[model samples]
Target: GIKSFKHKGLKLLFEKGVTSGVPAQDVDRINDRLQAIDTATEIGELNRQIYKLHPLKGDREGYWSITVRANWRITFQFINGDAYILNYEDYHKLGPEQK
Candidate 1:
């Protein structure tokens, strides 16, 4: 069942100029729109949209990442304004029955 899955931290490395996943594209688009944003609310709204559209996926397990705090649960580091997808993992592991 679902409990069989395990959640953890993942560090993803992206090759230069690689943009194949939704997370990468979402970050790129968000950054582009951020330049035009003038208020905190705008930024928040944009971020919410990005999060909803892309949703965080674990790098290996293929599950959504759940945030424990108010900070970014899934961070996207960029190089020269190009966003890259870092590694992602589940927040916790599931039991054998859950799998």
Candidate 2:
């Protein structure tokens, strides 16, 4: 969702050493691994993958993970069942806010 190169650059810095930083060409590899992940049986495996992919610590105390695809940041909050989609905008007030 990053429109400009700037955002992508920043994300690159943020996720540089993480597994999610794997080149875009490796998307299939990541998906292949994720396919085997089961919520109940593979929770530990899932956490390991998440830790490698999303190395950033969240603002709150809980298990959190993040992934960067193209120019977007995909964040998953494990405990809260919340997900976030991040992108760049040309202007701050150009988009509508949801209530």
Candidate 3:
């Protein structure tokens, strides 16, 4: 479904539905987003309002993302009907917090 992953934590979370890297309150929502991403054969399938999906800008222009919480998001690159470089992060932060 999701293909390869550049984010080990997100991959773990997606496969097992849990991970220690993210906040407890965000687990359910993240898993829900992961499920949708996994099943969708194309990025367009996630364009619905509930996911708040959109393309990133500037340095992150090639990626698309879906909101998970306040600033947290699940970002990835889509290629040939597969998802790559999947990550969970807070995009507003400038440094380590962004990870």
Candidate 4:
């Protein structure tokens, strides 16, 4: 189960299918990915190549992300068997220097 969320908008999307700031068409993709994260019991479950899963570096260190489309991604930290600090964002907006 997801232990907690750092992004309230993402929490709303996960709990009630509210897209908020995200693209409406991506809801299905978001839901499927979030569901995968919710059911995962280990970080390895999220290491799949299809997800384009990878760890964020620099300031976002310790958080891992899975691509949704283009620059958009779902990021989180897994700790003690549960997912936490969930966020939906476009990391590229900050540019490669900052991301």
Candidate 4 residue 67 Cα shift, in angstroms, is 0.4
lDDT of residue 60 for candidate 1:
29
lDDT of each: 0.31, 0.33, 0.78, 0.83
Ranking by TM-score: 4, 3, 2, 1
Writing each residue's lDDT as its tens digit, candidate 2 over 37-84 gives 213242344454433434333232332233333333333333223222
**lDDT ranking from best candidate downward:** 4, 3, 2, 1
lDDT of 4 by residue, 43-86 (tens): 88887788898887777778889988888889998876789989
Each model's TM-score? 0.20, 0.28, 0.81, 0.86
- Residues 10-76, model 3: lDDT tens digits: 7778777657767777878888888888778888887778778877766777788898877778899
**Where is the poorest 10-residue window by lDDT in model 1?**
1-10
Top TM-score prediction, candidate number: 4
Stretches of candidate 3 above 4 Å error? 94-99
Q: List the residue pairs that clash in candidate 3.
A: none
What lDDT is reached at residue 83 by model 4? 92
